[PDB]
Symmetry: C5
Subunit: 165 residues, 5 copies
Amino acid sequence: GPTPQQHDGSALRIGIVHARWNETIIEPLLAGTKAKLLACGVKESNIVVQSVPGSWELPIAVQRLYSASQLQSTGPFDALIAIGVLIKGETMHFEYIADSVSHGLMRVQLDTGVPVIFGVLTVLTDDQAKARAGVIEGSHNHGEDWGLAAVEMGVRRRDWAAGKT
Amino acid sequence: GPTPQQHDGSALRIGIVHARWNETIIEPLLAGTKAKLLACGVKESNIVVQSVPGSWELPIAVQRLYSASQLQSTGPFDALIAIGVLIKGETMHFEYIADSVSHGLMRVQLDTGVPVIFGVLTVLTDDQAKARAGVIEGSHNHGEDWGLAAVEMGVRRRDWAAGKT
Amino acid sequence: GPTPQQHDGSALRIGIVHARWNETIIEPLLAGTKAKLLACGVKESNIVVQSVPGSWELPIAVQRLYSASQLQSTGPFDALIAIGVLIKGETMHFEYIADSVSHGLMRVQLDTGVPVIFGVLTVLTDDQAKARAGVIEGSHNHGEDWGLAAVEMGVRRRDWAAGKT
Amino acid sequence: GPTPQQHDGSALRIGIVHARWNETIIEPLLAGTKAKLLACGVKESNIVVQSVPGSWELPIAVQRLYSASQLQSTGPFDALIAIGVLIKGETMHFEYIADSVSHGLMRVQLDTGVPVIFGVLTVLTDDQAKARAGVIEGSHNHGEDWGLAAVEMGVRRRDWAAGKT
Amino acid sequence: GPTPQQHDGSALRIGIVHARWNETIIEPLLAGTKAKLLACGVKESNIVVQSVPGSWELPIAVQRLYSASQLQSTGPFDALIAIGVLIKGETMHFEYIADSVSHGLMRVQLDTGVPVIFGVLTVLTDDQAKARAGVIEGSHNHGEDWGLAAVEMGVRRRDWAAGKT
Ligand SMILES: O=Nc1c(NC[C@H](O)[C@H](O)[C@H](O)CO)[nH]c(=O)[nH]c1=O
Ligand SMILES: O=Nc1c(NC[C@H](O)[C@H](O)[C@H](O)CO)[nH]c(=O)[nH]c1=O
Ligand SMILES: O=Nc1c(NC[C@H](O)[C@H](O)[C@H](O)CO)[nH]c(=O)[nH]c1=O
Ligand SMILES: O=Nc1c(NC[C@H](O)[C@H](O)[C@H](O)CO)[nH]c(=O)[nH]c1=O
Ligand SMILES: O=Nc1c(NC[C@H](O)[C@H](O)[C@H](O)CO)[nH]c(=O)[nH]c1=O
């Protein structure tokens, strides 16, 4: 378990990209993460949320979303969140996508210099996904953690960008 | 399971590179993906389709195909699709190629800033390949998913390129 | 087991970023690493210590922390330390994060040309974490090793930067 | 199994780098790949063949070989082939080298924009190597596949370089 | 088993970086590699040897060592050797470090365009390390192989740098 921390992040602009596989799990997740964002003061209008078919699209989509925000409510995002739900199938498809999407996101992060919250679940059974999405009774929705983290990192990124230590 | 979406993508130019190992599986896949492309309004003439011997050639081939479209019916592709079929052999050849082709494609994607649909199957038995290719009675051809995704991502890439969020 | 070596590093400026998951393990670790830093003559004021929620944030945070020190007590850090504690859960989350955070740090290191001490534990049970953190009576705290290493590498980085061999 | 295709590639210049571990397997392989090259019209003088001690040297060697051809019978190679034979030992040495050599080659390929045929065997037993090298009576020599692929890709690379689609 | 080859490499300048974990294994290794270097005509004064605490430091240290030699007995090294000894512990620490150090070295190699001999042992038991270090009676020291390879690659690098094929 982690240690909770709520930051201002009211001057933050967050970008979220979620995949659409396993939507019944994606929604609960997205809901929780968006919730905590507002809960932290992020303005509803400063939260961009786009989707893609699968997790594989996550990294490319996040890279481009940010890319767009730069060409420009307005202003390059201060933090990004990638939400996806991978579940083991009968083949190794699961593992090859999980590993690449993982490194992919880690890259976009370091490449871009902008925090990309890892909101991707790499589960083995449906129930595990549900449990991590808060779907099950008294189960902790990790989305909340991700929104919370997005804000913290967004704030931190700014300070670093300001040369503050 | 995912949640498809049909987008316009009639102003899209899609590039497809498929390997030739396990052609009886490649064809059904390619067929389905090309089908859904047209089904989305992609003009037959705006769908380029080239092949390579194995999956290892997929990433290099995709990188160069796009590269070519840039030097130029005409205009850099808006989305790319890599189709390959890896099946476990007796050695670790399967895993070393799958992992590299996977990262390879993920890279070309991020490098190029152009979505590259992951149409590569990493299966353990022939039947699994067939099932994923729609070959087996009342099975689902994933190719359809890939064509569908190619369009969506192509459209999305354009908007991002336009700084739209 | 390694061979101990204490260097001057009194003219060193060290940056430390630690995650907050498993704080009861993080603290003992951080404590030991900071201890050995001072023990080597690093001035208390030349030791910057910031935190992040999870290990995933480690690489991005380290990259940016250093980045900031460059824009500028003052002067780009001579060495960095990433402290995190991953513990196997019920899913593959553990492994996908460990592998990416690992490569992520290795990258920031080579990218930046600045040593980033790998103070991340990839454990299977709570006790293992405690044992590596010196928590368990008469056990060895690896944090000490990391602080010690941070100094050595910091010193070495400088010489290399000076073209000395 | 793949689908055979013989291309011209008489105007091609191919570079081959093979390791020397397990030479009794390397030779049969190299022989077959060189054979099919000529068989496709590649001029004997346009086939450069150098060696290195182990597979680890493969990627660096291929990168530099091509690099050299650029500084310049003459003309940067149109395709490269890396031949190596890894066999599981008692330790994890096998896997750590196979994975790095694999990504290494995939990188040189994408980096360089030149196809690098993956002629590396990642086997578990001597016999498997022999079988893949055509050594074991009636077994298939994969080298033939690699030479064949080198030509196709070489030809294709040229067209892409010409902006042809 | 590999095929032996002794080259001149008397005009070579070799840089060696070894970790200090498991020194009783590192020393025998380093000894053997340095031995074969001299045995090949490398001048004692042209062999630089620095150390680092663990294997994780290997890639960064090698990258910087070379880096230094460039700013400049004198002259950028023609080949580099990384010596480290990883042994499975109770946790996954072993695997996460081995995989990153491996890719790290492979990268410095391709990045730098200078061969970096992989003198890192990824063993499961102390005895395996000893056996690979020639320690056990009548056991073959791999260090000899590495020194030998360093020379060959150094010589080859030069020729490639000279555009020779
Ligand atoms: O297939 N299983 C999954 C999946 N599809 C793979 C991929 O994201 C993509 O849609 C196409 O491969 C090519 O772009 N995506 C997930 O988020 N979870 C899964 O469990
Ligand atoms: O070997 N099995 C397979 C394969 N060949 C490997 C590779 O693509 C290539 O042709 C050469 O290795 C070197 O370029 N390619 C596949 O698409 N599926 C397989 O199941
Ligand atoms: O989940 N378990 C762990 C964890 N959280 C994962 C991650 O670091 C992050 O906080 C979010 O995934 C997205 O940024 N972080 C750890 O350091 N150890 C764990 O054992
Ligand atoms: O060790 N076994 C093998 C090997 N040597 C490892 C490596 O390529 C290298 O020579 C040195 O590690 C450092 O450069 N190389 C192979 O192609 N196959 C093997 O089965
Ligand atoms: O821990 N075991 C080992 C080790 N230490 C890990 C690492 O190299 C480093 O010193 C610190 O983690 C952070 O920089 N280094 C080795 O070469 N072999 C081991 O068997």
